[PDB]
Design a protein around this ligand. Structure first.
Ligand SMILES: N[C@@H](CCC(=O)N[C@@H](CS)C(=O)NCC(=O)O)C(=O)O
Length: 212
């Protein structure tokens, strides 16, 4: 009986919160059509039973074969092994595409100094993604079907869109049309729609972190 601990929404602990690592795991569970129970963990008031099975107090955590396993990388790899069909393996050459976007996004979101180069560093990572997407068959990073890299990136690109839009009135430039198309593709996946955090909870999640 699979169970997953994920972040509860800031300000509404009975709703799904905004952890993109948790969403990567939920996406994988859904793309594998698996049944599972969700535990919403209020990270500002962690329950004791959760601390007892997540030694670092982090989410996500998956209960499988009666062991609780941390780290969304490990969780999605174990699911891929245990439930091989349909396959989500991304060819190795593409498995790190987009991998620096989320970090550059967070640095730009938190920047107070518009000459510190943070916008440019994000635009460089977006350009790398545009360059991959315009030169390889789509609609996903590895072609016709969604795979692990897309499931890792989708929640992160959603944060980028919602948070930079709301906090900075900033959106991915229209000069990256492939990135725009790719985001639309990911956000309209049935699995994405089912597992997504409401925008207002991406906002509440980030608000206390933007400018500590
Ligand atoms: N690398 C871990 C990252 C997990 C992580 O950073 N989770 C955050 C929520 S997004 C967390 O549990 N933070 C603990 C806290 O804020 O108290 C993974 O991929 O699972």
């Amino acid at each position: 009986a699979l169970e997953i601990c994920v972040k509860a929404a800031v300000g509404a602990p009975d709703h799904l919160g905004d952890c993109p690592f948790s969403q990567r795991a939920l996406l994988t569970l859904e793309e594998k059509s698996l049944t599972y129970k969700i535990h919403l963990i209020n990270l500002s008031d962690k329950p004791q039973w959760f601390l007892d099975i997540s030694p670092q107090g982090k989410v996500p955590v998956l209960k499988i074969d009666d062991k609780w396993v941390t780290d969304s990388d490990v969780i999605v790899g174990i699911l891929e092994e245990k439930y091989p069909d349909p396959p989500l393996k991304t060819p190795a050459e593409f498995a790190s595409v987009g991998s620096n976007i989320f970090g550059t996004f967070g640095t730009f979101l938190k920047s107070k100094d518009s000459n510190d180069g943070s916008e440019h560093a994000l635009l460089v990572e977006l350009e790398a993604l545009e360059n991959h997407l315009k030169s390889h068959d789509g609609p996903f990073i590895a072609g016709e079907r969604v795979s692990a890299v897309d499931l890792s990136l989708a929640p992160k690109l959603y944060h980028l869109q919602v948070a930079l839009g709301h906090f900075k009135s900033w959106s991915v430039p229209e000069s990256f049309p492939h990135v725009h198309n790719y985001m639309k593709t990911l956000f309209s996946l049935d699995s994405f729609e089912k597992t997504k955090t409401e925008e207002k909870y991406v906002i509440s999640g980030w608000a206390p972190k933007v400018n500590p």
